[PDB]
């Protein structure tokens, strides 16, 4: 049967990442991956996280599955993390949280449960993407539509656009935003926005749902959260597909939430129900370690708080790389204002380099960004700065 | 949306479980599930398992994906436990091993796999199952069709019957195999039986697929797989979907493997690719917690020793339990000869109960046994043993 096979390899994820580690070159950067570095160039295990494998290793005493909502404070904490701390979500029990596979597993949850339970038809996606948002939906049979999220000559929001291009989004319809540091132009909307928004959906009468892949990577834990808030403050119903891969930099042990807001109390459980069962229907049981690594360190209140410097630590880290980026390029003679990379959220920069110019960086200098022209800032050491931005002003 | 939502519960899973857990009753019993109770009624963690918990909790630096065969011996060791060290299948570089979900997260690669690259049409299982198997291939789109296996009058294989059923079965047809312990008789074909088969299938052109979830629960390690190995003997193509949530206890780890055997190193290198990728477009990243303690355990010539020795101690008490349990029957005064028992293969034994004496077991009882009749001898304790077989003797 196999004699007949094609290939495959093609995949820009082990693909520009393999390919940078079979490339047999001198000083060669790689910001094209998105995973968070020290500054001595490694990729460190959080140390919140090594202590809590610890008390994992001598407190465990079964290995058995106690069920997707079965992790203790797992589903809790999740939600004090999304909606606050004494939010009236919490209060009157109208959210349920279950474990999903890292990331992507959690959209495909809510799509798949999305699709079995709910007469939804369109779910709006935000364009420019990375077309990756739009497979998922597809797949459990939903269409997908378009809207305008981009910048202005000003690097600002073109707010009016977003809305112009959200005026066909029947009610019924499902809208995706994207929470904190959006993937590509780093521009999230202001608290006035984010509210202004969360009015015309509830007016219009949209499934909001919102994906959180890299809370606390904009401004701080509870800012980051501050749009998505906004939203459960007057609405009835909403999903969450949640990521703990980034801030807790388990990369490969694959935590991801998805949350489901209902009306009240009963609506949430029966529905959460059609959803628990509809990964039973899947892809099998979900991955334990990961989960339990996040609840112990976010359950007790004294991991919890070294963990949340770890992540301000990384963060600031990041400010300070893009401060450097900024700077070094104006040095090395670049003559485009670059002030503007300030002001962009997240672990990535968008300068807007050509699909070309992209290309002669990697064959030319060894210098790795994506073919879009997301460079990882967090992979920006001082060591490496300096090549890089030579790299980068010679390529203009 | 969520309003008009129906409920789901049913399944007997989480159902005849925490069902269990909410019989407010005294001494019940819980043969229904299928995991290992040591003799105390509690479910450790393998020795072996804390062991190799602790070596990566000092040795991990980052926590980042190295792909699906990107953990180091995972694969090597799967291969050697599978097909034999010094095995040809291993030296010619035959095989290629991938990371999977817990049990069902094979066999559902195996299925996708298995359509989206080749012509074959239909899938043969066996037939009485548990029907599980029979939806996986569906969902690929793959007919399925049933063969015969089960027992005679004097409780051994009706081998014929066997070969009979499976005569219709069409060259390039994937046929499914139990390599040990066979829900639902307990009874696996001898030596001399695999063989047979073996040589009917290189005859007639079946693409063989072995589950492999207990292997070490029957005789042994290196003894469960005799029927597999005499598959590869002679075979040019198989798949092998295995399982480490049994044999490890890493029950809520989610450990699988899917094994592609083909013709020659470049043929099954080639197909590989399509499977890896064909694992993209679905459950996103494995869990590597799991296969890395597995991993651990197996690389290192010191801690599989202790492993070896953890399994057959489990082994070992069941066979022990399955006397005790024979003995306690006959002597609380049932009249048929249940020495059929002891000859049965892994955890679990079919006195076959109908479907109203398991009922009747955990309603008048508190003797919960699956709605089929399969009872885990592996929760007999020589403490619940003695009520166990009256509450049994006086249905029966």
Known sequence: MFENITAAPADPIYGLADLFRADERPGKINLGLALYYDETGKIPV??????AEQYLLENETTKLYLGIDGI????????????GKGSALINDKRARTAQTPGGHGALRVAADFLAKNTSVKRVWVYNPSSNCSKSVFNSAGLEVREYAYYDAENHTLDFDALINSLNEAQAGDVVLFTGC???????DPTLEQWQTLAQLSVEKGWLPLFTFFYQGFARGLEEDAEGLRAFAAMHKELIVASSYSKNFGLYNESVGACTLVAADSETVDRAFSQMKAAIRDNYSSPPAHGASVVATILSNDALRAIWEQELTDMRQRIQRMRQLFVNTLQEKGANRDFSFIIKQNGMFSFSGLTKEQVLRLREEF???????GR???????PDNMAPLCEAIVAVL
């Open 46 to 51: 959080l140390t919140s996280v090594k202590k």
């Open 72 to 83: 203790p404070e797992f589903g809790r904490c999740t939600q004090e993390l999304l909606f």
């Open 181 to 187: 540091c959006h993937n590509p132009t780093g521009i």
């Open 366 to 372: 060894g210098v790795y960004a994506v073919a879009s």
């Open 375 to 381: 460079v990882n800032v967090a992979g920006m050491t």
